[PDB]
Amino acid sequence: PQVTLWQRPLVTIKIGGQLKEALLDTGADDTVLEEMSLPGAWKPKMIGGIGGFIKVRQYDQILIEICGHKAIGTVLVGPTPVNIIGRNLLTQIGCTLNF
Amino acid sequence: PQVTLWQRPLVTIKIGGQLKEALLDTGADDTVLEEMSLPGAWKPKMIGGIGGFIKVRQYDQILIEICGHKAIGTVLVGPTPVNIIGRNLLTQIGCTLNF
Ligand SMILES: CC[C@H](NC(=O)C[C@H](O)[C@H](CC(C)C)NC(=O)[C@@H](NC(=O)[C@H](Cc1cccc2ccccc12)NC(C)=O)C(C)C)C(=O)N[C@@H](Cc1cccc2ccccc12)C(N)=O
Predict the structure, then answer these.
(1) How many angstroms separate the CA atoms of B62 and B38, rounded?
(2) From CA A97, how far away is CA B25, in angstroms rounded?
(3) Structural domains in chain B?
(4) Considering A25, A29, A30, A60, which one is annotated as catalytic?
(5) Would you say the CB of residue B3 lies under 6 angstroms from ligand 1?
């Protein structure tokens, strides 16, 4: 689909058997999700934002269904205020910016 | 144009006589630019990011040319690491997201 921007661009995602709502974010180089129940071996990382830098756990090869479309990649779990779908998975679902 | 997201979606903007480069950010409700001399008066505002908050100066009715398209709107100035075009200006240039 085509999404206009009068409202935040939120989509329903399925990850780890759980259902969440997440923001399509062209300004995020990576994907970061609120703290959640995920299996496996993860590793520290820190990513910067507007209000400062935050501490996160990187999980690789994580399957995500975004707007019921499949993608496999790296997901970061941490204290973000919102679930964010970043460019690393937007390219995989073939998403483009158009004006 | 059609912007794919393999690299950051950067664009040339003209604001207050000066040329800068800014990020098209569907994850930002508002447009926040780096400190710069902006002709005028302003009301205070604070926005939230990934690292927490920030204190910024809000200017209204500022003309901006984004990739050659003109838009008039509210612009925030302050502590951001990158100039960001947020959804208040992305809807005025006709920008949509497609997948
Ligand atoms: C800027 C306004 C704000 N939006 C936002 O902050 C969301 C916006 O897409 C931001 C822009 C970024 C460019 C500042 N995207 C990101 O922060 C992403 N960072 C990167 O991609 C960085 C960039 C980055 C690159 C290089 C150096 C950096 C140094 C410091 C910081 C970032 C840096 N790379 C990394 C690896 O760390 C995260 C998702 C990985 C917004 O709309 N705020 C609202 C709503 C709101 C409230 C509270 C928390 C929010 C969290 C996210 C989105 C919206 C949020 C408001 N009214 O205050």
Answers:
(1) 9
(2) 10
(3) 1-99 (2.40.70.10)
(4) A25
(5) no
